[PDB]
Motif scaffolding. Sequence first.
Motif, PDB file in Angstrom:
ATOM      1  N   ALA A   1       5.633  -0.862  -0.372  1.00 20.72           N
ATOM      2  CA  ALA A   1       5.080   0.564  -0.190  1.00 20.72           C
ATOM      3  C   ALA A   1       5.210   1.518  -1.426  1.00 20.72           C
ATOM      4  N   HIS A   2       4.328   2.253  -1.756  1.00 22.33           N
ATOM      5  CA  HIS A   2       4.615   3.487  -2.672  1.00 22.33           C
ATOM      6  C   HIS A   2       4.298   4.870  -2.127  1.00 22.33           C
ATOM      7  N   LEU A   3       5.243   5.682  -1.646  1.00 20.30           N
ATOM      8  CA  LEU A   3       5.291   6.842  -1.032  1.00 20.30           C
ATOM      9  C   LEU A   3       5.222   8.110  -1.917  1.00 20.30           C
TER      10      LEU A   3
ATOM     11  N   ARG B   1       1.587   5.514  -9.660  1.00 29.65           N
ATOM     12  CA  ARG B   1       2.181   4.349 -10.464  1.00 29.65           C
ATOM     13  C   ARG B   1       2.728   3.228  -9.385  1.00 29.65           C
ATOM     14  N   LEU B   2       1.714   2.223  -9.241  1.00 33.66           N
ATOM     15  CA  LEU B   2       2.218   1.035  -8.325  1.00 33.66           C
ATOM     16  C   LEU B   2       3.111   0.217  -8.772  1.00 33.66           C
TER      17      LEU B   2
ATOM     18  N   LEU C   1      -2.384  -9.464  -2.926  1.00 31.33           N
ATOM     19  CA  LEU C   1      -3.674  -9.870  -2.069  1.00 31.33           C
ATOM     20  C   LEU C   1      -4.563  -8.797  -2.238  1.00 31.33           C
ATOM     21  N   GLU C   2      -3.948  -7.483  -1.883  1.00 27.28           N
ATOM     22  CA  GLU C   2      -4.807  -6.253  -1.458  1.00 27.28           C
ATOM     23  C   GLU C   2      -4.059  -5.195  -1.486  1.00 27.28           C
ATOM     24  N   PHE C   3      -4.417  -3.797  -1.531  1.00 25.06           N
ATOM     25  CA  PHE C   3      -3.927  -2.653  -1.109  1.00 25.06           C
ATOM     26  C   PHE C   3      -4.655  -1.791  -0.075  1.00 25.06           C
ATOM     27  N   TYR C   4      -3.835  -0.945   0.327  1.00 25.81           N
ATOM     28  CA  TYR C   4      -4.385   0.138   1.310  1.00 25.81           C
ATOM     29  C   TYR C   4      -3.825   1.574   0.849  1.00 25.81           C
ATOM     30  N   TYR C   5      -4.420   2.390   0.903  1.00 25.56           N
ATOM     31  CA  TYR C   5      -4.097   3.867   0.535  1.00 25.56           C
ATOM     32  C   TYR C   5      -4.895   4.936   1.366  1.00 25.56           C
TER      33      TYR C   5
ATOM     34  N   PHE D   1       0.077   7.692   0.805  1.00 22.71           N
ATOM     35  CA  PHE D   1       0.660   6.445   1.311  1.00 22.71           C
ATOM     36  C   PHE D   1      -0.200   5.225   0.349  1.00 22.71           C
ATOM     37  N   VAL D   2       0.482   4.400  -0.212  1.00 23.40           N
ATOM     38  CA  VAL D   2      -0.109   3.176  -0.818  1.00 23.40           C
ATOM     39  C   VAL D   2       0.909   1.994  -0.254  1.00 23.40           C
TER      40      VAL D   2
END
Lengths: 50, 481, 481, 481
Positions: B328-330, B341-342, B349-353, B464-465
Amino acid sequence: PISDDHLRASLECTYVHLEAAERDALTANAGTQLIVQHQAHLQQVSSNNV
Amino acid sequence: AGSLTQLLATGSMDAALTQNATRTFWKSSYQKHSLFALESINQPFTTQVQFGAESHITVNRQGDLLSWMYLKIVLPGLKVQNQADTVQPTQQSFASLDNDVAAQADVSHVLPYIEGAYTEASLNTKEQLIAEAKNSYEAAKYNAAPLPVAAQMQSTEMPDFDYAYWTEAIGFHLIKRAEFKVGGATIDTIWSELLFAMEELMGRAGRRLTETIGRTLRRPTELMKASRQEQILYVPLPWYFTKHPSLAFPLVAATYHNIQLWVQWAQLNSCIIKSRSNLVVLHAERNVPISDDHLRASLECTYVHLEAAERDALTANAGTQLIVQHQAHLQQVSSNNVTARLNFNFPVLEFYYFLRRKANKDAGDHFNFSGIGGRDPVVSAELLFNNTARVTQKPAVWWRAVQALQFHSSAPLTNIYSYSFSLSPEDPITPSGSANFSRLDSVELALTLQDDFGAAHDANSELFVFARSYNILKFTNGLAG
Amino acid sequence: AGSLTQLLATGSMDAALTQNATRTFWKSSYQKHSLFALESINQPFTTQVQFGAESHITVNRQGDLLSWMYLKIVLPGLKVQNQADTVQPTQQSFASLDNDVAAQADVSHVLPYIEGAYTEASLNTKEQLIAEAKNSYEAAKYNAAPLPVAAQMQSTEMPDFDYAYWTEAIGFHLIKRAEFKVGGATIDTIWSELLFAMEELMGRAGRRLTETIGRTLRRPTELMKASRQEQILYVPLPWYFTKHPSLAFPLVAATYHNIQLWVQWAQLNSCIIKSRSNLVVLHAERNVPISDDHLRASLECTYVHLEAAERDALTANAGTQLIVQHQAHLQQVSSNNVTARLNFNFPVLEFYYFLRRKANKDAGDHFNFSGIGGRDPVVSAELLFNNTARVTQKPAVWWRAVQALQFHSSAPLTNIYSYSFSLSPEDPITPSGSANFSRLDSVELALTLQDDFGAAHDANSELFVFARSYNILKFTNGLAG
Amino acid sequence: AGSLTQLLATGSMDAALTQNATRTFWKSSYQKHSLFALESINQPFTTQVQFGAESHITVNRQGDLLSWMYLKIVLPGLKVQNQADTVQPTQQSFASLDNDVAAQADVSHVLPYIEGAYTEASLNTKEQLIAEAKNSYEAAKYNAAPLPVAAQMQSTEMPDFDYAYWTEAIGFHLIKRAEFKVGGATIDTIWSELLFAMEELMGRAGRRLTETIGRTLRRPTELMKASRQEQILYVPLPWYFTKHPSLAFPLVAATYHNIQLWVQWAQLNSCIIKSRSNLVVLHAERNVPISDDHLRASLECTYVHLEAAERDALTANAGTQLIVQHQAHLQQVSSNNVTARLNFNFPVLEFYYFLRRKANKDAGDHFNFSGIGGRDPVVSAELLFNNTARVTQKPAVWWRAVQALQFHSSAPLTNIYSYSFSLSPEDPITPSGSANFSRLDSVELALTLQDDFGAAHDANSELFVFARSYNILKFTNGLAG
């Protein structure tokens, strides 16, 4: 009003700078360190015998 | 003559498809399997369960594998009473519909476009002036054609009586964070916002979690009806081992490690919405003010019992499991241009935001990821690796609808965006693509948001990421790591 | 530089996933298959088809395999006339909306909670007193918070004209029982109630049987519209051989056995609901009273034609097919505590259970498995093997929603409960778990039902329990058994 | 004792299922894969994009394979102005709701059944007489029971303001035809009507293309809302290589051939519906009359980047891909009996057919495949090979609902009919049945349509028949054919 964003913190670290010969020796063979780790058992108490 | 001629009408091309055929459609073949049984067992938390607290459970060893895991939550029915009629009116503040902070925030953005004497106007005249100012704002910002004022005046028929209800998808909202731990190490972490995003994208048609998590698809009257009585929710915890039987967690192979679920609970003040600001919220059965100790939860685990030969084989050599972990990047958002900046690790595999307005959060609408006036909060996004465009600037609809269409079982009903490096990110056992973020010096998600996003009343909106990454869980000599 | 570096950034862990890769994503491989053709053929029953009768058909041998099987039902359009205007008013009685037995049964449970002069009250005052008594009943029985009286007064806008309609999901209701027979032996049996439960749990999103079985999801106005004209229904018969092409029934391997479908039809009185008790129901085209001989049905079978080489191979060695058979335990309910003794045999994959109120059945709402006031009829259930808890007491939502979420393609919209011993009970070719009930001395399903379930006006409510079990069908020397 | 006894209770039948078991449920196994990455890249057309024109794009070589392909369409927002207020009122004619040609055509069929002084009647009296004449027409033609006149008087609550909107599913309607070309040869062709039919049958629940193609499920108020602002549509192009990763088009293996997408665009006059005939339709932002140059489109392609070893292997030996090609038979309908001579070639997997009334097309309702009064336009159909019935006469519901239930992911909401020769026509890599039409001297689809279909105001109604056929694409020495 005091809020959750009023906490400020930073990390203060002490670094050691080595002479090149000791740095090179440590890079070539740092080997193993004996470490102490911490473990926790956390329990709720609802009786005089636990 | 024709059907026999079709079987004879074969050439050198048909040889690649049908020569030495190893399968027939006219005879079933089946494989034999080993003997196993499934048992569902409910277990209490080891610590007290309360709103706003952290609680943990040590998972019992009642079988050889651990398969499904559900958080069984019991919420009391709600009643309301006037504060004037209550012997102890002092309670935590709850969001109230007579003080709609989200609607007030939306009005604040159109105030510069109100023509005429707004302050002195009658209520019905203020509603007209706000609807006209919305047209002027949307024409100025988006070149939108004006909507008829009557089409913008949607009265939600709110009932003419007092009520309180648990917020939408309360079963997810209650789980601010859950951690799956083995031997004191955190193996994976899930968040409320991630659970909702995963159900939006991966939730199959006819198997949506609606009733199991207290989700009504934003129908307040159904939340009110449900909240008048005790609710029992079964919130699935989507750990790697719950996704496929071959990934079931081998309890026998991890004999010397305690398995623990840790849960950080939502604060009670965030879980309830009321019709009016001056109401006290009561436990419907006990007739006392609702308090943090009225949360009840237990863990329902499905155990697998194996035949002795398979159990002994698994104990001798459980080997390694491919696992998916969540990162998580919040970030807080205070400007229409946002760079995230992730700092994620491993093969992603993937990300959601997605974004949440401060006003939507403060209104208790925790899974409302819409922008101002219910619009899409993202105009465009770009993905950079080491300052080089991995995905050039694309509009919000590409990240939301095209990525979901290509890689997911469902398209999100909310403003959830995704991007997959995997051809099949929902396959838990077959790796189908990844990007190794532990080998990238920088990964940046650059966002252009709607106008005035994160300004004024929406200062400290949330980005949210979440990323899904491959790792390996190893079992050796009764230990797991 | 980054994408090439990712392909080089491999270690000893990647070797287990990618070393000696036997698959590529960048080149398609396909398998060749044998030549076959499909043909759909409609066939009349061998006996007369009538309401309340039993009819059979001997299935023709028009190909080498039998794949899909549909019961093609033709129902006439309905019209109504006043009994006073009819030259022959004598007809079977039908359920009528002016005599709502289900609503009367629900009112009977709240009569003890009516305060004041109910008998002498105006109609509008009686409706108010019933809604207040419902709040008092639900507060006393369930600790429910009271609903606003106006929210309980749902007027279903019923049309101000005379009508009759075929009951909800009439295509299933018509099939009280069907038996698939080979050589005079019953291979499998299906029931109306099982067909509905199977469609609720296994019915895929976007492929629900709605129109094909006359199901509207309880919208009476759509049933009325459909019932004004002739209806053609195609009811799928979910036999083992219709589930996968490799299970298609080998007609050529069973040459010396007759294949028969037997169907027990529903009584005409149970198939129709009318607006008023004093109406005669007419055949819309013929303008005669509707009678038991107005049911028409035929069997639509999909045959497979094989190439001679595959046909000859199948005739020489059809071997054995894994089959799923259905078993039923049907019980009357007269108490809130019910124990069902499940005398099922063989390796059981799963079972389904549900309850029907007598009042719902008498109202013609045959697939309404709800309790009193539309509540969940089950509070909790327990499963015992030899008096030992195999599944300890669990609430209704666990048996209905958690079991469906874990093992089924869909969650039921009605109060259907399931439990699976199989990891994939919808896979027709891969055994994935079972419990052998022929080796258990007792299997008991203990139910705690809602208060007053099976009391008074609901005396002789029905419990249905259906099990799916593995067996083997063997083909040898032109015979099947 | 019971669970261990179940593992011991094995016989000679269990040996066929479980002896030498090659799979366990209690340990995950995974396969390693080669390294790859996905990149989405948007590309402009090589020629100008305009309504009613043909445009082409040469697809760039930005990776090793081509996977997904989306037509990104940008449509301006619409506004309307009275023709009297416009400095240049001369524009193309658009369909208008004050001149409902479809409703006028439906009224024309019931004119012979109007009793009394229709010409001199008040508007409300004309609506009553039309509803009564509809009952008399439907009783005479279909033996239908009369519907209450009040149930036929559905007022669509149309807004009391001026508007224009883009037609339903505008993203498909815009693509009259698209051609995928390689080396100047057409590899496949798709049509607007085929794209819609494919989405109806193969569109998965929770992944319907609704927003991505501008489809509202015939809710005019939602089309109006969407059409007030700029719309960005992502129309998937369902080529063989977009269906499975192993079919991705090998760009590296076709190095000496240009890859082109050609698109024939719909005429602007067919794309827009307006509230009134006397309105001019304006570009909402530019405040100019809408014109053919206001269409914008680009091609969004997903490229696959391969590791050097897999890229080199694919360049050396791409071999052959199994492909599905589309074929079309388009016919005018002027009679209730229609025979379509299907001059299709190759192994046909399946075909689709449907009818469009001239009045529905002229009303701008391009995907309304319903008959007169919204009825099913097909009564029955028969399929003949060399004048022999391959499928004997079957009712419309069998071709629409039974064929979709057996072979497709979804049942169509519109009057789309299908027939499959394949057991799994949606599997792009596994052939599961076909009929070779290049070996049949005649293939005839004989249709019996509803009464008065193709008569009077519906003269030149359209029959669409589309077939899916197998072919082989070969890659050799940098060429594809």
